[PDB]
Amino acid sequence: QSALTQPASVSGSPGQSITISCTGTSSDVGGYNYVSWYQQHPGKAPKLMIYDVSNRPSGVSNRFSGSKSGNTASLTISGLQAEDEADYYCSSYTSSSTLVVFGGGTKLTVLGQPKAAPSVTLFPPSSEELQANKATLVCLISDFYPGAVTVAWKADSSPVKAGVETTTPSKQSNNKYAASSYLSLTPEQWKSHRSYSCQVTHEGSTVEKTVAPT
Amino acid sequence: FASVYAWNRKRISNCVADYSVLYNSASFSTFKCYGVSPTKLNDLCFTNVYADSFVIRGDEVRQIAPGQTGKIADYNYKLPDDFTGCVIAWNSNNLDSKVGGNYNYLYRLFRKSNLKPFERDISTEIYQAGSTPCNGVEGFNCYFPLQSYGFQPTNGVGYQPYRVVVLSFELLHAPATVCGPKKSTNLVKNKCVNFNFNGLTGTGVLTESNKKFLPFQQFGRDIADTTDAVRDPQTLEILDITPCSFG
Amino acid sequence: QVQLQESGPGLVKPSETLSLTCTVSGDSVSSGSYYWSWIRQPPGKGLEWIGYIYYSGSTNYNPSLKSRVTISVDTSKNQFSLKLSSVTAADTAVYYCARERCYYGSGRAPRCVWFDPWGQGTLVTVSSASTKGPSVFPLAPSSKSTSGGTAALGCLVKDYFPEPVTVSWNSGALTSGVHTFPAVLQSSGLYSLSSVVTVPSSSLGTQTYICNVNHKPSNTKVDKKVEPKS
């Protein structure tokens, strides 16, 4: 059995109120007085803020509160902030065998922000790598809050589509995104073409940077 | 048996106690005597014997002894530091452990202060570890004070249940009480013999009498006060006591 | 307060028996009052529970993972550890250790809830791609990276399998502008990443900027200095 965290994803506007439900099976999960909630930042251990069914431990924000109704458990917030984008899980003490059950996770998003500009930075293969009989171009993208970036790579005049790897966008602390791409080259091809470039397109807009061998 | 946190307390009283059937029964895994070595029990008399009974783990039988520490001796059952009795213990895996776990045998694991010897505490108040008051509800630093051995038949020794009985001989200031049993033999006659009639120790020839005591008198005396007749306790017949020959 | 830390990693192969070990600090193990547990989480998926040990030696396990996992206690170094045998490819997960509160039952096992302080979580993977050490290059600060008051320099650490790898700047000194980007998984099967930091353009070579590369599944530790291009 598994107390389906009601909905998977969740949208929210910064400031007002979000309520997350958590339904499950019968009184072995709902009709008890033992439920808890956990907040896990992306890349960190989770952290409780609600226990028993509605108790705040020693030092948390007062926006966090929950309640119980029948076979569903509720968790609500009373004013949103930009630092509250995380996942959220439910706990519960059954009687079956799995002792304790866990939620499936809800994604809280803070819809509302100004289109940022993808800061781009490009690096050519360093000297030791040239001596190492290889070459790699490094294209870094950062701070571009709406995450639909894409990238294209350029030799002196033409596009290239071989030897490039592209990270999926990853969320930073400031809740905008970052990405990276790598270009594989033999140093003889590095000096073959007089210059390369990395271009990034984002909401129609485009910014490109360029580097030439020495 | 009885739990470990509410042990029982039977007050054995005036009787004939035979600690030999105990001492040699070979069924006991632990038989330690402290005030008095075991073989001399069937030769002494006290005022009261108390017997306490309970059930613990296998490797907590070493805390039932004078001057120990641990979850059991601290606050479940404390033995004074000049104990006198004996401690007996035997394994009972087949009786007390049941598949799925026997959760009826509890013990106390939190208390404000260690017990006084032979003190008992069956309360069930929510213990308060931290400074925050508890108000009768559980939570962090507010713990229920009783836990339960979940005994199961496939437990390694030292986790199987042992039953324990602690005999404590005490001697207040009464006139007497329970003691061991005294053997005996057959009574012979017409031979200079060394006799003991429930306390009367003497020597001489014993002979069938023809006097008649009153039915509460044990032995008869002469003028100049020497025992010259007795009554046999078992058959209740009067026998004269003549000295054996000297000259 | 209390803290928890896990140890005993390594690119475990298939059909082995791995062993993690959680150590505690700030609270004794054999004190009663808390039940030490283990929770795994496969990546991009929800949590699931594994087991717990009490200070006596009483154990419990998940019935889906039953007959496969044993967890045990050391009271000498205040630590507890699991061992999961016959490992398949599905156990590539992040493994936390935490303690539980575990309220008192009523003649029928003890119920537990909420938990408390979660370990640190050490990603443990299971494959047959062996392991490899990282190759490091310094990406020099350049005028093509320079703009006005600041210029960026960094370190490229590439071609390693054993996912958890770390690069610090100046033994952990610089926290301004230091950003390590998510590692990328190439077609070769090995990871690669690059960590970059911006620093005033007046300070191109002036101060120390040495990236400290540490690879924990292996034992690689190398410091590389980044200087402007020749």
Author numbering:
A (entry chain L): 1 to 214
B (entry chain A): 347 to 593
C (entry chain H): 1 to 230
Publication passage describing the model:
RBD, which directly binds to ACE2 receptor, is a major target for development of the therapeutic nAbs against COVID-19. To further explore the interactions between nAbs and S proteins, we solved cryo-electron microscopy (cryo-EM) structures of the S protein in complex with ten nAbs, in full-length IgG-form or in both IgG-form and Fab-form. Bivalent binding was revealed for the full-length form nAbs, which showed that the full-length form exhibits different binding mode and induces more RBDs to the “up” conformation than the Fab-form that is monovalent.
In pattern 1 that includes P2B-1A10, P5A-3A1, P5A-2G9, P2B-1A1 and P5A-2G7, two “up” RBDs are bound with nAb. For P5A-2G7, only one Fab binds to one “up” RBD in the S/P5A-2G7(Fab) complex, whereas two “up” RBDs are bound with nAb in the S/P5A-2G7(IgG) complex. Taken together, these results support the bivalent binding exists for both P5A-1B8 and P5A-2G7. P5A-2G7 (0.03 nM for IgG, 195.49 nM for Fab) exhibited even more drastic differences of more than 6000-fold. The first group, including P2B-1A10, P5A-3A1, P5A-1B8, P5A-2G9, P5A-1B6, P2B-1A1 and P5A-2G7, has the largest overlap between the epitope and the ACE2-binding site on the RBD. The heavy chain of P5A-2G7 plays the leading role like subgroup 1, whereas the light chain of P2B-1A1 plays the leading role.
